[PDB]
Amino acid sequence: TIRVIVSVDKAKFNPHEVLGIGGHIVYQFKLIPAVVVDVPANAVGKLKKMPGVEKVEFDH
Amino acid sequence: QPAQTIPWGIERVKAPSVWSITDGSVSVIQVAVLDTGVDYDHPDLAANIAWCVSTLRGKVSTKLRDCADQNGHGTHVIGTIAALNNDIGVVGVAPGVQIYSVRVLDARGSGSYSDIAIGIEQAILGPDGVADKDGDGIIAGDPDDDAAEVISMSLGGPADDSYLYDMIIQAYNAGIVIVAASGNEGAPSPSYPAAYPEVIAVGAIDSNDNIASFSNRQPEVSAPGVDILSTYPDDSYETLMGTAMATPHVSGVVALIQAAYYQKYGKILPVGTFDDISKNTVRGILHITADDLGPTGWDADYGYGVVRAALAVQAALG
Numbered sequence: 057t058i059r060v061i062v063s064v065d066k067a068k069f070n071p072h073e074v075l076g077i078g079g080h081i082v083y084q085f086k087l088i089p090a091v092v093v094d095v096p097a098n099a100v101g102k103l104k105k106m107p108g109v110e111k112v113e114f115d116h
Numbered sequence: 117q118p119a120q121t122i123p124w125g126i127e128r129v130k131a132p133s134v135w136s137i138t139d140g141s142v143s144v145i146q147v148a149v150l151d152t153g154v155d156y157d158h159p160d161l162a163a164n165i166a167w168c169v170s171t172l173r174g175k176v177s178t179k180l181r182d183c184a185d186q187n188g189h190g191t192h193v194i195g196t197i198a199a200l201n202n203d204i205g206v207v208g209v210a211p212g213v214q215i216y217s218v219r220v221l222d223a224r225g226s227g228s229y230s231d232i233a234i235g236i237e238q239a240i241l242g243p244d245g246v247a248d249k250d251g252d253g254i255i256a257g258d259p260d261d262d263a264a265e266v267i268s269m270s271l272g273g274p275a276d277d278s279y280l281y282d283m284i285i286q287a288y289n290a291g292i293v294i295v296a297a298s299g300n301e302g303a304p305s306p307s308y309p310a311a312y313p314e315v316i317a318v319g320a321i322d323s324n325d326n327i328a329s330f331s332n333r334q335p336e337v338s339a340p341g342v343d344i345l346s347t348y349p350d351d352s353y354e355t356l357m358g359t360a361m362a363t364p365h366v367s368g369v370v371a372l373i374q375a376a377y378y379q380k381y382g383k384i385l386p387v388g389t390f391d392d393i394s395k396n397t398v399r400g401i402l403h404i405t406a407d408d409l410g411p412t413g414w415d416a417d418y419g420y421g422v423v424r425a426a427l428a429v430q431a432a433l434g
């Protein structure tokens with residue numbers, strides 16, 4: 057499992073959908089449209105293609 | 117507890133002469149320090165700790181045991197901003213300012229960008245969990261809200277992440293002055309978030325007015341960052357060096373500017389930009405009142421120069 061931060065279009069992204077690729081939500085930002093998620097390392101590819109997903113960034 | 121001294125850096129940034137005007141104890145003003153946490157019961161700090169929060173591992177906690185400093189770095193930085201002016205220990209640049217201690221770094225003094233971004237969000241939201249309660253677009257400086265007016269980040273890294281930048285943009289749009297360490301690698305330019313245009317990059321000088329060799333270059337301003345005595349756990353004091361120690365001197369000067377301005381005018385100043393050289397903006401004021409060391413003008417070692425609180429406050433109130 058790795059921690060990544062996803063930048064999303066709120067109107068088009070569903071946080072429940074991260075379970076579908078084996079991940080879970082850690083924190084949903086109140087001030088920016090982004091969410092911290094834990095996903096399997098091999099799932100970063102799939103996450104990138106999810107509905108409403110604009111960017112996936114590694115935790116630095 | 118030892119008898120109070122004024123550390124050399126506090127004298128250097130010309131803070132003591134400001135105190136008769138303000139010590140920063142204007143009720144709408146808070147400084148959020150995003151660091152390793154705080155020794156919240158330290159006798160030379162306690163009275164100024166207004167809120168203690170932790171964002172470690174992406175969970176927000178206001179539990180004292182989660183927000184307590186396990187490293188020392190946060191306690192040291194906070195003491196340079198806000199150590200009390202009394203009979204003991206040391207004294208901060210703004211010895212009456214309220215502090216929000218936001219723990220984004222762990223026992224190691226290491227932290228994730230995710231936890232840092234959450235920390236910035238907590239500084240904007242404040243204890244009430246809402247950025248703009250009355251919906252008027254005024255956040256920093258609105259006495260109806262509880263947002264911080266200064267975010268102080270004695271930390272940095274090499275990555276420029278989009279979400280972290282978006283969070284910096286949100287703080288900047290809330291009217292918050294953002295101050296961050298240039299970094300300690302002797303690099304040609306500052307670390308992030310210092311390197312963002314919305315953020316004041318702070319380099320370190322020593323007590324001879326020489327730039328520290330470790331100090332990352334092209335800062336916006338510089339400040340005392342070598343042989344800095346401050347508070348340290350548990351209820352003690354320690355001397356350290358780094359751009360992490362320079363940062364809080366600048367954050368304190370900002371806190372005095374905004375406190376004095378609100379005390380006189382019932383508003384705060386706009387944050388301003390890197391290029392600003394007017395008296396109409398916090399950063400403009402910092403730049404024109406800084407002690408211009410090295411070559412004339414902004415230079416890659418000192419930035420615009422060493423911050424000076426006494427002159428900055430006079431420029432603000434003039």
Ligand SMILES: [Ca+2]
Nearest residue numbers: 144146262263
């Ligand atoms: Ca405030």
Ligand SMILES: [Ca+2]
Nearest residue numbers: 155157158351
């Ligand atoms: Ca203590």
Ligand SMILES: [Ca+2]
Nearest residue numbers: 200202204206
């Ligand atoms: Ca003291």
Ligand SMILES: [Ca+2]
Nearest residue numbers: 241242246262
């Ligand atoms: Ca609030």
Ligand SMILES: [Ca+2]
Nearest residue numbers: 248252254258
């Ligand atoms: Ca408001």
Ligand SMILES: [Ca+2]
Nearest residue numbers: 250252258260
């Ligand atoms: Ca208001």
Ligand SMILES: [Ca+2]
Nearest residue numbers: 409411413415
């Ligand atoms: Ca110069």
Ligand SMILES: [Zn+2]
Nearest residue numbers: 057080082094
């Ligand atoms: Zn997890």
